Symmetry: D2
Subunit: 242 residues, 4 copies
């Protein structure tokens, strides 16, 4: 009865890392509210789980949607122990090929959408609770073709730090996981990507969504003297190993 009586919101929990995090929460006995954008993913969840989990379709980028999301969460959960921010999008292109539209899209979801979602949902967080952000190994260093994604994630990591400072009086810890290549789901080059992660990750494999899930829930419930910190789940990729 580990997560018994605990309540969590996972933003972007219909899929991959978020969903793996949802599975551990539910099997640990927690009550979970999760969001996603895609109709198909929500449909699957609503069938597989039932009313021990609340699947809400909600665009992280829409501030009006965020306000309604906060009203519903407060109604359903009342108050929570964990807010997990997981939603993220990426468009790989060389720096001089970035258009204003592609630039805006990625920052809308990855940075601004996350900030205002956090701003709306933070008053529901109980003392002793926490926020865990899903970042990326890309949040430090220079990776060609990821100028916008890497930068949107670096900003998110900065938000976690200031949120960790400003939320001290409320006894809410704020931390980030930094995943490398994680094997989860355009297929034929989604495939080419997983190979890259195999070649270049020092541990020579992709991570599992459950490995990220484990790191998220550790920071949430066990790292009770940890705030403003970052935790690598990258097979050594961000750790300067030759």
């Amino acid at each position: 009865g580990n997560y018994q009586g605990k309540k969590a919101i996972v933003i972007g929990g219909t899929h991959g890392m978020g969903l793996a995090t949802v599975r551990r929460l539910v099997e640990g006995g927690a009550e979970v509210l999760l969001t996603g954008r895609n109709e198909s993913n929500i449909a699957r969840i609503r069938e597989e789980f039932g009313p021990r989990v609340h699947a809400l379709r909600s665009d992280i980028a829409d501030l009006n949607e965020i306000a309604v999301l906060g009203a519903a969460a407060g109604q359903t959960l009342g108050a929570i122990d964990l807010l997990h921010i997981n939603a993220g999008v990426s468009e790989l292109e060389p720096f001089d090929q970035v258009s204003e539209a592609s630039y805006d899209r990625q920052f809308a979801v990855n940075t601004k959408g996350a900030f205002f979602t956090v701003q709306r949902l933070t008053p529901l967080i109980r003392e002793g609770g926490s926020i865990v952000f899903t970042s990326s190994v890309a949040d430090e260093g220079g990776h060609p073709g990821m100028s916008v994604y890497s930068a949107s994630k670096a900003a998110l990591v900065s938000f976690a730090s200031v949120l960790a400072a400003e939320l001290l009086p409320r006894g809410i810890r704020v931390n980030s996981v930094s995943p490398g290549f994680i094997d989860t789901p355009t297929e034929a080059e989604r495939a080419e990507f997983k190979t890259l992660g195999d070649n270049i990750t020092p541990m020579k494999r992709n991570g599992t969504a459950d490995e990220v899930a484990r790191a998220v829930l550790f920071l949430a419930f066990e790292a009770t003297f940890t705030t403003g910190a970052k935790l690598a789940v990258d097979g050594g990729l961000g750790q300067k190993l030759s």
Copy 2:
């Protein structure tokens, strides 16, 4: 110490650190073009310097103006050794006070405009040349009331890294300076008054390990070292912060 035959663009060079940088560039023999958003600041620049430097009123946040700026630079300088991105704005707000408008404003100038300005001007940059970003000690760690500003600067540092990686085949270095409470007429924050700046400066004196504010010239020296002397340096950061971001357990 001599920039004879060099040409440089300073985005946000109308006062403070950027202007200090302009001054050393000119005094060393550089051909310089600078921008600013405020019009009377531009007038003062044209008076101090005369036809010696090219000063353009140009909003960094505006993509049409960035295009106009690009053509102007290509027309007046043709090809450059240094692009200094210095422009910044900041609005101090506790995290639950931040509005969409104030959020958008700071990212528009500090992050998006810097990205697209660099995108438009990078073709002018010659082999051996460099881009220097002005970041902030706030680009790392948690400073209350500076959530948006810190994040917009953290984003800029990331861009500096990816640019350093992508521009390697062009032999263009990309680095960042990180101040630092710097004694300047805006203090980095335009909205506040003279009263609230004098207090911001004093906060600087108290919490800076070296017990003082930096000068604009100290920042300028670091920008120009990175631009012209640090020829084996790229993707790096150089602190000009009196120790503030260096984890010195005083006081």
Copy 3:
């Protein structure tokens, strides 16, 4: 059965966070060999834990004794899943007062002894096993009075990185915990008075405004040891934010 069948070595597991790590190990079903120096501590732990622990009096700074621990560990445990290096000493003094003797004591234990202990015991570590080092928030930045201690832990963190790289082909992960102020009944002594004054300092400079518990560090060591299977060369702060630049 959480750590059922598991085998671990905790270097300096006689007190505090090393001892809290031993406890969580034994409670989850692991067999542990630990080392230390204090007679009463070692005797007490033998008494408490019986056949689940092997407690050895072994000076981490003594290379002759490291060789004996290697024979003993290999004889008593054979193959292991976790090597936890926790042992450390601190001597607080301004830089201009550090003696050669005081400098040597801290490095002998915190760094060299750690290095040669890891060198000697690494061959026992199973594939899929790991090493965890106890560092300190002092391993980065500048803290007056702690020049030697800070440098010694900074060297340890470096060792951890190079080991994480060299041990990739064995499938052995190498990570570090970086504790801040951690609190340590009811016994008298001059150590225990010095511990009190330091605890008090930690209460009011740590951003979370309290010391951490030994169990909090132990939980982080054992997460890295057994749960962070895609984590190596990494550092994990248990410092109430002290190391994370929060104003």
Copy 4:
């Protein structure tokens, strides 16, 4: 004229980047005292500079010799504006092959010797002066064959931090430079063959993002910038590494 009237001590300035720093100091009008362990290299320094520089055989690893150097520095320079700790050794060994002797030799020069040299000479540094340490890109991250050297430099960088904090009230700044595969006669590893240095050099050209080794002068320029121009900089690190330590995924 830019270092006119200044006095500097370079610890390890008989060749390589230490010598590049000395040469830049002397062109700028500085008065310089430099050290090295190799008496033949010291003879070569006196051949080049004559008496415009003070050159002393002084083993950084020996505390007795450090004490002697402290007296000699006092007598010769009186007070100084720059202390540059550059001396170093490296021995490349897989971790499982490191012997007590090889470990001791590297920490004795790189860490302990550096510490007690700074401790003995700090009283000579005057108002507004500084200390600069030469670290390495190896002081962060994991590089096989370099467990001892990397840890010894990682330790040096921590010393710089604490010293920057403890020396604040004396108005003395303390910073480090971090090369970088640098083209020096030893490549920082004095004990290997020239076949292995050439390979080390080639490795440098391949893994370095800027795809070349750095020059000794490039490091010298960064040391002297920190020494004299970075007057609001302390406890900081400056990369001179062609991007190697900056996580460029090229």
